[PDB]
Short mmCIF file of C-alpha atoms and ligand atoms in Angstrom, two decimals:
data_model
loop_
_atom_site.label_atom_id
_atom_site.label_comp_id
_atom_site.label_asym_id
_atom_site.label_seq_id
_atom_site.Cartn_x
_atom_site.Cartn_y
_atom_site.Cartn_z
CA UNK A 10 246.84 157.21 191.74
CA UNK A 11 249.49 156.68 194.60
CA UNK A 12 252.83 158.18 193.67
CA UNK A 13 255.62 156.27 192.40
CA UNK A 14 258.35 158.12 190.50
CA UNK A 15 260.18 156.73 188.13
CA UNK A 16 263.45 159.08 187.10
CA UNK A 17 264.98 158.51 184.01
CA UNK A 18 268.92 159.47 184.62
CA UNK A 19 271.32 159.72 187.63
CA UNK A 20 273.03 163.05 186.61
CA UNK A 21 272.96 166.34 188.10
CA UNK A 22 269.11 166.66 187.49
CA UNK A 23 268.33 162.93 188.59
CA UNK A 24 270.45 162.78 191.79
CA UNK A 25 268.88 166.19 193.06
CA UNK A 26 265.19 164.79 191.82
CA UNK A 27 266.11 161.54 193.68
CA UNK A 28 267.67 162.65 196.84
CA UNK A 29 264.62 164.99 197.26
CA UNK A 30 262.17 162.09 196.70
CA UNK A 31 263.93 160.49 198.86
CA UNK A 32 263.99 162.93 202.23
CA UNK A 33 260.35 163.39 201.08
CA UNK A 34 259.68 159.79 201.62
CA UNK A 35 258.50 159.48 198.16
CA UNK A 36 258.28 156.14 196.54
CA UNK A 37 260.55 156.39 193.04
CA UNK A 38 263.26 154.28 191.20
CA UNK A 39 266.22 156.17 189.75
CA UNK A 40 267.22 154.21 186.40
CA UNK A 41 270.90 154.95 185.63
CA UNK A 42 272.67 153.10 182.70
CA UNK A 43 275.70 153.71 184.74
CA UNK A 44 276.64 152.33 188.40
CA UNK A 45 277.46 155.80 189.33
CA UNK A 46 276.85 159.07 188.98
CA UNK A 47 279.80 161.38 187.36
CA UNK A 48 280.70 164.78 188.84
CA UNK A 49 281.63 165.71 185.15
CA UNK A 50 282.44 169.04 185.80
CA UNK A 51 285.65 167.76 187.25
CA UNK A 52 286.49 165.58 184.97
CA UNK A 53 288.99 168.47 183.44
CA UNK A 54 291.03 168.81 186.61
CA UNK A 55 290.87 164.68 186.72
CA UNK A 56 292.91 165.05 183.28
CA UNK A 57 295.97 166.81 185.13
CA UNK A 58 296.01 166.00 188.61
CA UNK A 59 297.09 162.31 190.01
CA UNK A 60 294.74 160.55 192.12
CA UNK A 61 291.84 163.28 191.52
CA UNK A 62 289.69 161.05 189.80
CA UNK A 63 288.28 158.83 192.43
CA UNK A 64 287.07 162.25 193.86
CA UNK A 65 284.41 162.35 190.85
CA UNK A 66 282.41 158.95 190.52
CA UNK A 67 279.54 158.35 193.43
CA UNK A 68 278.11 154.65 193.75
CA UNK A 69 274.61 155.06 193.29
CA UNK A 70 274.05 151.76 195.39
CA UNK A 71 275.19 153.37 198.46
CA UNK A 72 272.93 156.25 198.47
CA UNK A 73 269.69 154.80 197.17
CA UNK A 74 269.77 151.29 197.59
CA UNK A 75 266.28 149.61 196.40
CA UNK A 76 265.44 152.85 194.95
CA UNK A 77 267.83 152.14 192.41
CA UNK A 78 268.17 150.54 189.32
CA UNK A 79 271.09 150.23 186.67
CA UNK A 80 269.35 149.63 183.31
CA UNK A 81 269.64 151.07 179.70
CA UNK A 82 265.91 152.96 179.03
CA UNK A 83 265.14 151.66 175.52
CA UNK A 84 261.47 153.26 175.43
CA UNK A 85 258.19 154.85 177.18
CA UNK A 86 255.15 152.67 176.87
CA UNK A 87 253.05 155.96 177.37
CA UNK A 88 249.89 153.88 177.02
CA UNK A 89 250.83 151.54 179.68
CA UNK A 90 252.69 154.01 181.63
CA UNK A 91 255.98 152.66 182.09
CA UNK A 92 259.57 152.99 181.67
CA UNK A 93 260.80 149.97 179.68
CA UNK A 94 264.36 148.57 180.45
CA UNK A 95 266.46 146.71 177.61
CA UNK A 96 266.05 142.87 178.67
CA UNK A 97 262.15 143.30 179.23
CA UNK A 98 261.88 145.15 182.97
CA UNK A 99 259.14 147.55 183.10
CA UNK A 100 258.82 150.44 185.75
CA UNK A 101 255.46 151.29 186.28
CA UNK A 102 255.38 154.89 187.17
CA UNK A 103 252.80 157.81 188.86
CA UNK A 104 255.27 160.63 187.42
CA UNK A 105 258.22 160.45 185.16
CA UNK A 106 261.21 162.73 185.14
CA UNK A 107 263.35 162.58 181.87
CA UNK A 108 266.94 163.92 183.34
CA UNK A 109 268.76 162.35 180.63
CA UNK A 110 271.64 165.23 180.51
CA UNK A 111 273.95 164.12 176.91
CA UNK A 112 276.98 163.04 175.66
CA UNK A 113 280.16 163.78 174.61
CA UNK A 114 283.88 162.68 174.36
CA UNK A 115 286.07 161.59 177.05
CA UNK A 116 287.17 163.49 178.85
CA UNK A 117 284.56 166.24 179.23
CA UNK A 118 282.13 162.96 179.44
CA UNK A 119 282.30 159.57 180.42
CA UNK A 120 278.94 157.95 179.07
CA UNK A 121 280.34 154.55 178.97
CA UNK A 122 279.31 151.46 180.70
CA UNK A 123 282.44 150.82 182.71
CA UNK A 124 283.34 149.18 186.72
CA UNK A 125 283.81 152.18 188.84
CA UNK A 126 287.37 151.36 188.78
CA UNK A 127 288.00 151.16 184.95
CA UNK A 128 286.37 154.72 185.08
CA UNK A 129 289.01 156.29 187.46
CA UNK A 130 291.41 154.76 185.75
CA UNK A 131 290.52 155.84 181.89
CA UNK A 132 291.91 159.13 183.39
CA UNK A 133 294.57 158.48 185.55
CA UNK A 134 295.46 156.87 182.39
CA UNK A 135 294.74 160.40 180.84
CA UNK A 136 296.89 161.94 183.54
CA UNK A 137 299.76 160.32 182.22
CA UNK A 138 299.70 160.91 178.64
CA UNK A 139 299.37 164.45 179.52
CA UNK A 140 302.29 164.40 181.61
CA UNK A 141 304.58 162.52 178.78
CA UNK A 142 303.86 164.91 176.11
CA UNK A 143 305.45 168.11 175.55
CA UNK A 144 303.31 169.53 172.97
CA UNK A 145 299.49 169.49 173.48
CA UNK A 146 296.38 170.47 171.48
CA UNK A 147 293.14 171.17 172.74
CA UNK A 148 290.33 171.38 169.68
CA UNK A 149 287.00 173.36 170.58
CA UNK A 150 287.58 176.75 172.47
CA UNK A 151 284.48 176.92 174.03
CA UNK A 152 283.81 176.75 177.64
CA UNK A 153 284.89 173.83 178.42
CA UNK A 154 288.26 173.43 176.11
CA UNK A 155 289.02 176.90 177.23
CA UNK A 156 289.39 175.17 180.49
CA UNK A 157 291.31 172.36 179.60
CA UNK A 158 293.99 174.63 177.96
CA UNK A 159 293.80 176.42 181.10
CA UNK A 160 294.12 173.33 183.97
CA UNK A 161 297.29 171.72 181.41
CA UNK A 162 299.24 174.93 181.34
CA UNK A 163 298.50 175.56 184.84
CA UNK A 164 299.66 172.07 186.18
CA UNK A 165 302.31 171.98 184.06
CA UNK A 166 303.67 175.10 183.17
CA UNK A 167 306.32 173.94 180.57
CA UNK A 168 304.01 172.83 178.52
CA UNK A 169 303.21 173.59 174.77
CA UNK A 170 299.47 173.76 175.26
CA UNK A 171 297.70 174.61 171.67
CA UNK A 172 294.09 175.83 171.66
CA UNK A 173 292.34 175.99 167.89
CA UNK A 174 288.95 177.47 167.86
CA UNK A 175 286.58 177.58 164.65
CA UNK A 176 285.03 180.95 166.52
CA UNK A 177 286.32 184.34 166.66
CA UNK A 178 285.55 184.76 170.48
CA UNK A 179 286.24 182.30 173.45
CA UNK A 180 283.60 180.26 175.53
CA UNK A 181 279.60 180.62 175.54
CA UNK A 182 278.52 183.13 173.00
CA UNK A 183 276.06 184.36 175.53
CA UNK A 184 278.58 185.43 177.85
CA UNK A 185 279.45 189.18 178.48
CA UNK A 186 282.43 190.40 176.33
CA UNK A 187 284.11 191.45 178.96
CA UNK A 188 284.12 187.66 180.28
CA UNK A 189 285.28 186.35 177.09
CA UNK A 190 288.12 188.97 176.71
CA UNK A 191 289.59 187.91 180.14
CA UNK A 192 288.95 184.43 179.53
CA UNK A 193 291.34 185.13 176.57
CA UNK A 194 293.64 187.38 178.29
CA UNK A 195 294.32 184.45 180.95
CA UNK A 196 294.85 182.04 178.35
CA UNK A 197 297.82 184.00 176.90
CA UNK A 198 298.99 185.29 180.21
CA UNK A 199 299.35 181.64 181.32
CA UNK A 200 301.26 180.86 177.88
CA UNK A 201 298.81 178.88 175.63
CA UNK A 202 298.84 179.68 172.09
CA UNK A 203 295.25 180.71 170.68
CA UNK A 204 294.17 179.25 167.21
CA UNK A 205 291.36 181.43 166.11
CA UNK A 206 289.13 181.12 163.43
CA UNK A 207 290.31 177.46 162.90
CA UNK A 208 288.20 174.54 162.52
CA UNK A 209 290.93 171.21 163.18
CA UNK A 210 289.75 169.20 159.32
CA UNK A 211 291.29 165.76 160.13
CA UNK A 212 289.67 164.24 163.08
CA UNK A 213 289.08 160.88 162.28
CA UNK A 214 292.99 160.25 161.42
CA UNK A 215 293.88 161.65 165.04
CA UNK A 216 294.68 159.74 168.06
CA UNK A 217 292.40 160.75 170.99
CA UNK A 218 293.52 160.79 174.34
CA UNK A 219 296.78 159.37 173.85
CA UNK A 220 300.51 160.31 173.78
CA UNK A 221 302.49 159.91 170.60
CA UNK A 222 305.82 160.71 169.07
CA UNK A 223 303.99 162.96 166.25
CA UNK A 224 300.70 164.09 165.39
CA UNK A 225 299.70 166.15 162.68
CA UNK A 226 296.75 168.39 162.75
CA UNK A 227 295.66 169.94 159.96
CA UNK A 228 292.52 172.91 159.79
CA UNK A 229 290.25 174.26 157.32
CA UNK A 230 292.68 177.01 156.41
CA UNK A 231 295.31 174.60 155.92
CA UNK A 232 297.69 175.63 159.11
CA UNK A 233 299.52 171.97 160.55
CA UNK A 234 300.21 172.00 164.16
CA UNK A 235 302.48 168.55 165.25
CA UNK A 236 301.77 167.85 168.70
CA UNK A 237 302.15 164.98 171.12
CA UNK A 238 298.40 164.83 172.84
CA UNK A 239 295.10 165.68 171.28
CA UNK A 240 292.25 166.12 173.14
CA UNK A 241 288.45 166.83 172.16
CA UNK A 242 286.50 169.56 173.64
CA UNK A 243 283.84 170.09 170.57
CA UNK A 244 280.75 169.78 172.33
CA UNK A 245 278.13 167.70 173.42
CA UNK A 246 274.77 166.80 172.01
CA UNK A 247 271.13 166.08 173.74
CA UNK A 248 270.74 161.96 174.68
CA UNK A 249 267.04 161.35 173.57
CA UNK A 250 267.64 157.58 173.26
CA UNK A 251 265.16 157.01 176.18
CA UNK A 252 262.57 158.71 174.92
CA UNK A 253 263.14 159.96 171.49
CA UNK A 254 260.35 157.44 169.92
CA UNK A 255 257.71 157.58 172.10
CA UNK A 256 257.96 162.05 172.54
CA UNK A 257 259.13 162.38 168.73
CA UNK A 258 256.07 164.94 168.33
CA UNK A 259 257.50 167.37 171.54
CA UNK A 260 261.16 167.14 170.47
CA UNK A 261 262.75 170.34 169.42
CA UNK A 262 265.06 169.91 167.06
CA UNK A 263 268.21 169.21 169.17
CA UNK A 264 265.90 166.52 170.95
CA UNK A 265 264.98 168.37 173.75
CA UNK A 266 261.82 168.08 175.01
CA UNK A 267 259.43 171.11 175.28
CA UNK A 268 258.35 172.33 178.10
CA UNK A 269 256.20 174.65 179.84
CA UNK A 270 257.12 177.33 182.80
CA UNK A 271 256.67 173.86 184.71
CA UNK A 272 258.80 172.23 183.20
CA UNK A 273 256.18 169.78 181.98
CA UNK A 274 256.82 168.32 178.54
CA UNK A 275 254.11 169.32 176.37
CA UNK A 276 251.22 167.33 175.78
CA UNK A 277 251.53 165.50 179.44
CA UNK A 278 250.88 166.33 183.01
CA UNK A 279 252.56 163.65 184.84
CA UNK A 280 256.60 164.02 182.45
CA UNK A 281 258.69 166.90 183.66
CA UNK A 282 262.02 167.24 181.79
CA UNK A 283 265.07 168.83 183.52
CA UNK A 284 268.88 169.49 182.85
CA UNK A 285 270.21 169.39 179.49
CA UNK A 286 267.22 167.12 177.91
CA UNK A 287 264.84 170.12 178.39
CA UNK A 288 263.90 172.67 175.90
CA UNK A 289 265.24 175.69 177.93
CA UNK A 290 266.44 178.34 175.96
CA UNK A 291 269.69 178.48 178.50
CA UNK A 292 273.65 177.26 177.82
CA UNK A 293 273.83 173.56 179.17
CA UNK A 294 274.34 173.73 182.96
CA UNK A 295 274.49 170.98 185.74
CA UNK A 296 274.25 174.03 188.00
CA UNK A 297 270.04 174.66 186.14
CA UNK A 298 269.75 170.70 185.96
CA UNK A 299 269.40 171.33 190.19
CA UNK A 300 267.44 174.34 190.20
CA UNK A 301 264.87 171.91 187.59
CA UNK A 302 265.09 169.07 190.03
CA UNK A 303 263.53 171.12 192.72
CA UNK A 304 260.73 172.49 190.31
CA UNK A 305 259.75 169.11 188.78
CA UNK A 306 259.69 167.40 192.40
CA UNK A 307 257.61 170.50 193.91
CA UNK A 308 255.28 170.30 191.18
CA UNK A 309 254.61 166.58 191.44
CA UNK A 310 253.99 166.99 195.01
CA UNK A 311 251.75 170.28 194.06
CA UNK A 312 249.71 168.30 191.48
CA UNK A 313 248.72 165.58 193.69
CA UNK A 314 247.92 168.01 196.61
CA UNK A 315 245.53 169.41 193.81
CA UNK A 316 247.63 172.97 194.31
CA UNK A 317 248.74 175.49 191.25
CA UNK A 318 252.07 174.45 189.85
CA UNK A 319 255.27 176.76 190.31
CA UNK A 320 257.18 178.20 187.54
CA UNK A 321 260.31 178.48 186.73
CA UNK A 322 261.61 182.01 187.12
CA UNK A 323 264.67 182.29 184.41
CA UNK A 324 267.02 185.45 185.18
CA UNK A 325 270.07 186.91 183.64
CA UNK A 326 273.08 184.39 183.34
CA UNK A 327 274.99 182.97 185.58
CA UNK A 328 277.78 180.90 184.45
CA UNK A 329 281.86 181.02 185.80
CA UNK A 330 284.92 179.70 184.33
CA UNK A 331 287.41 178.06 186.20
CA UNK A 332 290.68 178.94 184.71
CA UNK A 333 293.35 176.45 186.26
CA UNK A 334 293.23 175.88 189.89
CA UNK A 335 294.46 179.40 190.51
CA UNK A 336 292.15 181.68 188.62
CA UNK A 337 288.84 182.54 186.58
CA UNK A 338 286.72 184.47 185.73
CA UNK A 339 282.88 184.61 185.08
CA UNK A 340 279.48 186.39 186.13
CA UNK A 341 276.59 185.93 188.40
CA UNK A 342 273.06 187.37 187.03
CA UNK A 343 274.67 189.29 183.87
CA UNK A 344 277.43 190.91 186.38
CA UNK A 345 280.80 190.47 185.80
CA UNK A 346 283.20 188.99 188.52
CA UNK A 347 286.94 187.99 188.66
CA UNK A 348 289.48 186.17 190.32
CA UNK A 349 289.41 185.95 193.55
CA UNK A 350 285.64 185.01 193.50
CA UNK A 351 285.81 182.48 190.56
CA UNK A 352 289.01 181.26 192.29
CA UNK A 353 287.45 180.68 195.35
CA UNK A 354 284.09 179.86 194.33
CA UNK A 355 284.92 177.39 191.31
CA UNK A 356 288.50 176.90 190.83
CA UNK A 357 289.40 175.31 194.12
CA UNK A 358 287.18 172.68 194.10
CA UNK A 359 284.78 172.12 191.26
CA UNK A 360 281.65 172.06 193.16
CA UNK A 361 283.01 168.33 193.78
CA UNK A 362 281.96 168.29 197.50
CA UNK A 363 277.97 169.59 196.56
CA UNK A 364 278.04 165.93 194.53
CA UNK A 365 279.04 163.84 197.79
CA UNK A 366 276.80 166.68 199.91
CA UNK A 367 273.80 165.31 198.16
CA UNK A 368 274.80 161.56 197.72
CA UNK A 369 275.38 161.65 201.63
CA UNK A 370 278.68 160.10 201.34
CA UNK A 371 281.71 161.07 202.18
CA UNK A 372 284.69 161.17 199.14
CA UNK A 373 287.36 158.56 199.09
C1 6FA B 1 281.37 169.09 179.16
C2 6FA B 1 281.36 170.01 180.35
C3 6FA B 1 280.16 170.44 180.86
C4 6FA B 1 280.11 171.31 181.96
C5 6FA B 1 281.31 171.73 182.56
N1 6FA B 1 281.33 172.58 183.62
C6 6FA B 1 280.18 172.98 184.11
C7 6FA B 1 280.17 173.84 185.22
O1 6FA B 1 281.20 174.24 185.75
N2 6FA B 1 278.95 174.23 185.72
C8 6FA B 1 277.76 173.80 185.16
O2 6FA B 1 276.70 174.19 185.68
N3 6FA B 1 277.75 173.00 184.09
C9 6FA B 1 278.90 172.60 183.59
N4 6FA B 1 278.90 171.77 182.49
C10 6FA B 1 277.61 171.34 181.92
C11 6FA B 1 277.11 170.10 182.61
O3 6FA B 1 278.06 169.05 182.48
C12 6FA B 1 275.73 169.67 182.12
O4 6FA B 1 274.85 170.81 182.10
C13 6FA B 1 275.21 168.65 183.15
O5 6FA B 1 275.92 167.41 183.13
C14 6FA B 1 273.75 168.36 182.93
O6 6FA B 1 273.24 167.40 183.91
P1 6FA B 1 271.97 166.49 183.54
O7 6FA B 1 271.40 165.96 184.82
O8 6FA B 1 271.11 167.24 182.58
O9 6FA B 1 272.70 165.31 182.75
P2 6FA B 1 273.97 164.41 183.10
O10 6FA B 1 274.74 164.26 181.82
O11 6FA B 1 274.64 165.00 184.29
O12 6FA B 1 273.33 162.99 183.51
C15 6FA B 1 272.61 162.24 182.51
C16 6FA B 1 272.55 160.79 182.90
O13 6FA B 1 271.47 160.14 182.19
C17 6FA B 1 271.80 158.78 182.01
N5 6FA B 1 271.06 158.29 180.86
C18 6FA B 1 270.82 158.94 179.68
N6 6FA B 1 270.10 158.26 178.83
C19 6FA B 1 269.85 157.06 179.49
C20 6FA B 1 269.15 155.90 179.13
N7 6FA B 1 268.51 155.76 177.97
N8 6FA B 1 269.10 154.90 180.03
C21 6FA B 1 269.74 155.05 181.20
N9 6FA B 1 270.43 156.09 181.65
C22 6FA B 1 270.45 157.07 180.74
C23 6FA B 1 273.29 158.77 181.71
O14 6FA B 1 274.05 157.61 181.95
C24 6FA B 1 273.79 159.93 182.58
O15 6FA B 1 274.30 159.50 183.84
C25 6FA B 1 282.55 171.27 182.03
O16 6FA B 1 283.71 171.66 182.61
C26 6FA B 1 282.56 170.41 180.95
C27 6FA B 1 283.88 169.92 180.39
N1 NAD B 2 281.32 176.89 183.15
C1 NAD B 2 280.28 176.16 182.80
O1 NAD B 2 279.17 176.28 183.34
C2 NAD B 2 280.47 175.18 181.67
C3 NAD B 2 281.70 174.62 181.35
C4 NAD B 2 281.81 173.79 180.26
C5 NAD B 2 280.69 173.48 179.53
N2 NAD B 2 279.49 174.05 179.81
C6 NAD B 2 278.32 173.87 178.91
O2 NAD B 2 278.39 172.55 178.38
C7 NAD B 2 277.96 172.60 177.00
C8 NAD B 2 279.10 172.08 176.15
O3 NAD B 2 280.21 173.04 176.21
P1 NAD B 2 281.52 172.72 175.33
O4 NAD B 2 282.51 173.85 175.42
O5 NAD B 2 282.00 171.34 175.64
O6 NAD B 2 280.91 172.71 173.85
P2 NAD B 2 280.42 173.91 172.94
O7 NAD B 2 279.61 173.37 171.80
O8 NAD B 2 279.80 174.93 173.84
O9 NAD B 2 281.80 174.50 172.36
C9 NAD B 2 282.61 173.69 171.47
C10 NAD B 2 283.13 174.54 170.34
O10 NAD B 2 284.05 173.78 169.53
C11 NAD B 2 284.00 174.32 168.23
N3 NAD B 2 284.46 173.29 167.30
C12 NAD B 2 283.75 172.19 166.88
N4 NAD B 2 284.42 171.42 166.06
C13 NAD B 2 285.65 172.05 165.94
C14 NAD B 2 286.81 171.74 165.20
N5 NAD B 2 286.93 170.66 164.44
N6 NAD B 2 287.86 172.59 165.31
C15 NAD B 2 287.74 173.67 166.09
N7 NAD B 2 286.70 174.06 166.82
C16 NAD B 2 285.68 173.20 166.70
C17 NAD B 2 282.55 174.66 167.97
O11 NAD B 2 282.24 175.65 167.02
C18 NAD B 2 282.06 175.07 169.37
O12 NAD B 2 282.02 176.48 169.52
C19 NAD B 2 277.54 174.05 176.72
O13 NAD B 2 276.15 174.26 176.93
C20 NAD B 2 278.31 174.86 177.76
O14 NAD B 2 277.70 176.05 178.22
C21 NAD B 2 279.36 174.83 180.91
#
């Protein structure tokens, strides 16, 4: 009937879906458990760099007023058609995009439930724990903790930064080797010490996040490495708690939904999935959870106008490393490309202004 989207998650996907909707004079609701959106791809360089972090939390409120709603999705009454809220509200909806990206530990993520203001300050907070300790271990050496190894040592070169990986090789497995190699040769140019083959076997007796005198971590292999600071970076996993119960037949078995060269989720013509919570055979990028956004909003649009549905064209990988503020590496359609580029392109800034570019507001 008449369209009212209802967007399930304010992340990279659900801001792009929205903001579109939105210029497009759409009706929709975006449904965010959070009161704003997190430019988590910065939330590294908010680890090591004072005052950074207000730069990477955007008020929803601001941007989308009445089209927005801060709720926890507990279900989809498919039969109804509606997205239900924990206390009882119900969103009645045309079309439904499931954006629900994942989650992960602090600081990679910040999935909590927090005032904008706790937020920035869980890692200013961070900042300084990093700056009291001398010794520092990073567990999980792919592409994310290979950047947190990198931003410590590069803010503070004095450091003793520590880097224990339970893989042979560096960063996305899908990556070129040449990209992994450099990755690794930066590492040790900029000093950190590379823990190969290690899987860190004590977790749940380490401090998180936090300075301290001494900390022992132990591995599989039975290495101990005492350190001041320990910091997660061993992935992240899909967040189906929207819609795990009433899709459980079209989840794939890392709760993705599955989806078709629309980005449809099977079985429906009216759900699109986009950004991590789809079933794309692709590494986990918020730079793909845009490029769905426009997909899943054209084809709403296409199906009402009665008009074939465009696909999604996957190519070769693009994906780039930020290595510090001063260097990188990474490739663009299966090509290699180095510093200066990644530098420039990545390492600078952190795609941070794109986030306030689509918000429409301007960073504190
Ligand atoms: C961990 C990590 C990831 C990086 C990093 N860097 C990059 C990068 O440079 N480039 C890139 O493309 N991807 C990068 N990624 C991957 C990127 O973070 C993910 O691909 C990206 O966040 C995916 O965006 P989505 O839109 O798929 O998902 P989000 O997590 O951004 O947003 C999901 C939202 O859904 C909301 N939500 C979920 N379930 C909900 C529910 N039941 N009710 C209400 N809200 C819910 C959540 O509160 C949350 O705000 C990185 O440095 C780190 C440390
Ligand atoms: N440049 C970018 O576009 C970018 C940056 C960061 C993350 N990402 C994406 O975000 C997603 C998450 O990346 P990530 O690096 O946070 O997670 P990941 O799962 O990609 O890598 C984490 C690694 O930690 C290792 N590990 C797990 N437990 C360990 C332990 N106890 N000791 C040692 N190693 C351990 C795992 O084997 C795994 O390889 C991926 O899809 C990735 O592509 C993209």
């Amino acid at each position: 009937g008449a369209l009212h989207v209802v967007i399930v998650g304010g992340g990279f996907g659900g801001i792009a879906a929205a903001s579109q909707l939105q210029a497009l004079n759409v009706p929709f609701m975006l449904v965010d458990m959070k009161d704003s959106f997190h430019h988590n791809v910065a939330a590294l360089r908010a680890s090591v760099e004072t005052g950074f972090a207000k730069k990477t939390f955007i008020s929803y409120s601001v941007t989308f007023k009445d089209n927005f709603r801060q709720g926890l999705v507990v279900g989809i009454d498919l039969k109804n058609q509606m997205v239900l809220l924990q206390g009882g509200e119900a969103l009645p909806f045309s079309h439904l995009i499931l954006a629900t990206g994942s989650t992960g530990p602090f600081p990679g993520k910040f999935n909590e439930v927090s005032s904008q203001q706790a937020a920035i300050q869980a890692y200013e907070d961070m900042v300084r724990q990093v700056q009291r300790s001398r010794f520092i271990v990073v567990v999980g050496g792919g592409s994310a903790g290979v950047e947190m190894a990198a931003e410590i040592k590069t803010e503070y070169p004095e450091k003793e930064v520590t880097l224990i990986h339970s893989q042979v090789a560096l960063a996305d497995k899908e990556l070129l080797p040449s990209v992994r190699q450099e990755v690794k040769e930066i590492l040790l140019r900029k000093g950190v010490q590379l823990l190969l083959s290690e899987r860190v076997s004590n977790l749940e007796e380490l401090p998180l996040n936090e300075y301290r005198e001494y900390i022992k971590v132990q591995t599989d292999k039975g290495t101990e490495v005492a350190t001041n600071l320990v910091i997660l970076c061993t992935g992240i996993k899909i967040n189906s708690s929207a819609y795990r119960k009433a899709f459980e037949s079209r989840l794939a078995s890392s709760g993705a939904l599955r989806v078709n060269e629309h980005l449809q989720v099977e079985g429906h013509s009216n759900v699109y999935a986009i950004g991590d919570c789809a079933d794309v055979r692709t590494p986990k990028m918020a730079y793909l959870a845009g490029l769905h956004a426009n997909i899943a909003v054209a084809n709403i649009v296409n199906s009402v106008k009665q008009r074939p549905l465009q696909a999604y064209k996957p190519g070769a990988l693009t994906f780039l490393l930020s290595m510090g503020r001063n260097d990188g590496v990474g490739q663009i359609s299966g090509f290699y490309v180095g510093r200066l580029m990644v530098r420039l392109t990545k390492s600078r800034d952190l795609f941070v202004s794109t986030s306030w570019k689509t918000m429409r507001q301007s960073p504190p």
